[PDB]
């Protein structure tokens, strides 16, 4: 294989004004609070200038759940809100995202379609209606040593178009494979060990660059099928840009035998400045 696969940020957050408002009616004083959140992803209608699907948060994200099909894909996360700004700032973001990634890992080895999530950390100044937030999207490579060599595949797909439709129907699934009859089915380690064709539901629109979530799914694949070296990886998008890759698991600075696999984690969203730092929104208009 020619190139070492690189990745694109998974999502771009947008916290609608209704999000901060629902927040103000679901926060307390206690030093923090964790609330579960659900966002429905629309991978069919992505703004033209976007590089990834929006993660669009609203008042409804706090609720029990209404998606309007097909391919709105529900994504679970949570918000961790701090009573005081100093604790928001003092938080170790790396150790924090690392847990979160571990949860995705544990979920993922039980069901590969569950190894992706998002977290928002925040501080709401409910007096000055200013909100500080930082979206993190746990993306992990375990072991941290694994990279992927790729070269273009002309197609040998399930045909992209059959994958597109399969994902539309199976809205809770992020992964599908081909069986021996070259039929798209749900992920099964026994089947893929033999047929070696994996399709991932991509959230990037960047040309020839898959979403960073890809690392999560590959980590699970490499755990289920430790002997897999070469396989075919289909990056499925609902637009024009699906593509296919010949993939080889490779390794950089590997770790000793029967030592326990560490895990490299990233996924904190860059702010408007393009920097790794929180975002701030001031809603003074929640008085006048």
Curated annotation (Swiss-Prot):
Intracellular or extracellular location(s): Cytoplasm; Preautophagosomal structure
Lineage top rank: taxon: Eukaryota
Record remark: domains: The C-terminal 40 residues are required for homodimerization, as well as the interactions with ATG3, ATG8 and ATG12; and the C-terminal 17 residues are required for the ATG8 lipidation. The GxGxxG motif is important for the function, possibly through binding with ATP.
Family that this chain belongs to: Belongs to the ATG7 family.
Complex and partners: Homodimer; homodimerization is required for ATP-binding. Also interacts with ATG3.
Function in brief: E1-like activating enzyme involved in the 2 ubiquitin-like systems required for cytoplasm to vacuole transport (Cvt) and autophagy. Activates ATG12 for its conjugation with ATG5 and ATG8 for its conjugation with phosphatidylethanolamine. Both systems are needed for the ATG8 association to Cvt vesicles and autophagosomes membranes. Autophagy is essential for maintenance of amino acid levels and protein synthesis under nitrogen starvation.
Name of the protein in question: Ubiquitin-like modifier-activating enzyme ATG7
Species this protein is from: Saccharomyces cerevisiae (strain ATCC 204508 / S288c) (Baker's yeast)
Lineage of the organism: Eukaryota, Fungi, Dikarya, Ascomycota, Saccharomycotina
Span within the parent record: 3 to 293 of 630
């Amino acid at each position: 294989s020619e190139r070492v696969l690189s990745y694109a940020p998974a999502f771009k957050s947008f916290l609608d004004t209704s999000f901060f408002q629902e927040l103000s009616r679901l926060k307390l004083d206690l030093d923090s609070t964790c609330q579960p959140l659900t966002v429905n992803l629309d991978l069919h209608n992505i703004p033209k200038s976007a590089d990834q699907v929006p993660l669009f948060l609203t008042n409804r994200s706090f609720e029990k759940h209404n998606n309007k099909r097909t391919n709105e894909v529900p994504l679970q996360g949570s918000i961790f809100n701090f009573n005081v700004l100093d604790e928001f700032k003092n938080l170790d973001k790396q150790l924090f995202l690392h847990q979160r990634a571990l949860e995705c890992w544990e979920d993922g080895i039980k069901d590969i379609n569950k190894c992706v999530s998002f977290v928002i950390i925040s501080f709401a100044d409910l007096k000055k209606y200013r909100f500080y937030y930082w979206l993190g999207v746990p993306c992990f490579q375990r072991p941290s040593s694994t990279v992927l060599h790729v070269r273009p595949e002309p197609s040998l797909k399930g045909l992209f178009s059959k994958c597109q439709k399969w994902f539309d129907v199976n809205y809770s699934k992020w992964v599908c494979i081909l069986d021996a009859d070259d039929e798209i089915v749900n992920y099964d380690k026994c089947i893929i060990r033999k047929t070696k064709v994996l399709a991932i539901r991509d959230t990037s629109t960047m040309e020839n660059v898959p979403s960073a979530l890809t690392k999560n799914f590959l980590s699970v694949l490499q755990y289920d099928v430790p002997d897999l070296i070469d396989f075919k990886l289909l990056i499925i998008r609902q637009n024009e840009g699906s593509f296919a890759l010949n993939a080889t698991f490779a390794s950089i600075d590997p770790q000793s035998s029967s030592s326990n696999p560490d895990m490299k984690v990233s996924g904190w969203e860059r702010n408007v400045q393009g920097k790794l730092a929180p975002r701030v929104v001031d809603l003074s208009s929640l008085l006048d």
